[PDB]
């Protein structure tokens, strides 16, 4: 009855975007980015790669409710470093690592004879 359609977990609703960034007034040079139709799968990955950065002072996500598939990621970088730049670098590093892993797994699987 009240159970929502499953495709709402990954399909963007009408009139809303994947990302929305709002500056955070608690601390300087800090943003809060709302990711829509996402979950812990991307959240923990992005958070870890952001914390791998040296100029990221703070980076943490939260899924405010398991009902709705969206999460808020707070990112605060040092002075003179745009938080969107930190997000860009984290995403770039994740993509590079995933590509290297895919290449390595393909090469390793090509070495089998009992498959």
């Amino acid at each position: 009855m009240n159970a929502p359609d499953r495709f709402e977990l990954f399909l963007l609703g009408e009139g809303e975007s994947k990302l929305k960034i709002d500056p955070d007034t608690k601390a300087p040079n800090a943003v809060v980015i709302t990711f829509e139709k996402e979950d812990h799968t991307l959240g923990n990955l992005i958070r870890a790669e952001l914390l791998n950065d040296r100029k990221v002072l703070f980076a943490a996500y939260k899924v405010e409710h398991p009902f709705f598939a969206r999460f808020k990621l707070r990112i605060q970088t040092t002075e003179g470093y745009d938080p969107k730049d930190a997000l860009k670098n984290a995403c770039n590093s994740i993509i590079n690592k995933l590509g290297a892993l895919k290449t390595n797994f393909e090469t390793e699987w090509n070495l089998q004879t009992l498959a």
């Binding site: 499953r6 990302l19 870890a48 790669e49 994740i94 993509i95 995933l98 390595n104 089998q112 498959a115």
Partner: protein, 262 residues
């Protein structure tokens, strides 16, 4: 350079490998994507023509939706939500038809080998139900007494495991790290001795056991994850892992694309 992989066992329906020099978050994200985010073909709509069996119509529909279907070239298909057709066409679906009649005096078992693909696949490698047993008969869909008849048509769309578990191609995914508990991420529950009461995992042979005198390595992080991915049959398990990595990369690239375009 980057994450390193060394595979132990290769099988048609299982791959057991090691995932070294990689962060814990990346390994868990790959596991989650394999569980949920791989598109796969499964029956989605059931038009029932005749059912004189003892099973309910939606019961048989539920059984049919769980039938694994070949999805090797599922990337060539399109989602039914973003296709220009009315309800279903050849570019976004596979139309099968299950027709069975109980002309035998004994019970006749309606398997999935009697599922006949109607829509012309246009040379793709999708639609065929996955057969695994040596007998050649697929999943036991229904049974028929003499004189019972079951005629129905199925439309199968591509889908991911998030919308419904019938689209899940990953089955169970064994995932372990630090078999010797060197990172001290667990506090082993015990009555007398934690070492005796907790059986050593099969992966403990792949790491050096602790010296029992060395101080705790607080700088150590998590890596070298032992992962065994099982394949339901829709796609070979190597393709399961590869497509999981591909879909995770696609998600991150979509984040980058939206960020740049806004």
């Amino acid at each position: 350079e980057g994450p390193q992989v060394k595979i132990r066992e290769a099988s048609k329906d299982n791959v057991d490998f090691i995932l070294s020099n990689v962060d814990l978050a990346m390994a868990n994200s790959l596991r989650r994507v394999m569980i949920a985010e791989i598109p796969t073909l499964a029956i989605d709509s059931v038009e029932v023509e005749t059912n004189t069996t003892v099973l309910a119509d939606e019961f048989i529909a539920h059984r049919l939706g769980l039938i694994p279907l070949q999805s090797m070239d599922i990337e060539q298909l399109e989602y039914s939500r973003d296709c220009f057709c009315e309800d279903h066409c050849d570019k976004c679906s596979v139309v099968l038809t299950l027709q069975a009649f109980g002309e035998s005096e004994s019970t006749t078992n309606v398997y999935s080998k009697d599922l006949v693909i109607v829509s012309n696949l246009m040379g793709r490698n999708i639609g065929h139900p996955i057969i695994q047993d040596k007998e050649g008969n697929g999943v036991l869909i229904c049974k028929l007494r003499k004189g019972q008849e079951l005629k129905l048509t199925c439309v199968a769309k591509k889908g991911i495991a998030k919308e419904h578990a019938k689209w899940g191609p990953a089955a169970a995914i064994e995932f372990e790290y630090d078999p010797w508990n060197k990172l001290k991420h667990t506090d082993y529950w015990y009555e007398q001795d934690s070492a005796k009461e907790w059986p050593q995992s099969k992966n403990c042979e792949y790491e050096d056991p602790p010296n029992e005198g060395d101080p705790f390595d607080y700088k150590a992080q998590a890596d070298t994850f032992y992962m065994n991915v099982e394949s339901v049959g829709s796609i070979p398990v190597d393709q399961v892992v590869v497509r999981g990595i591909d879909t995770l990369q696609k998600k991150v690239a979509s984040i980058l694309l939206a960020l740049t375009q806004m």
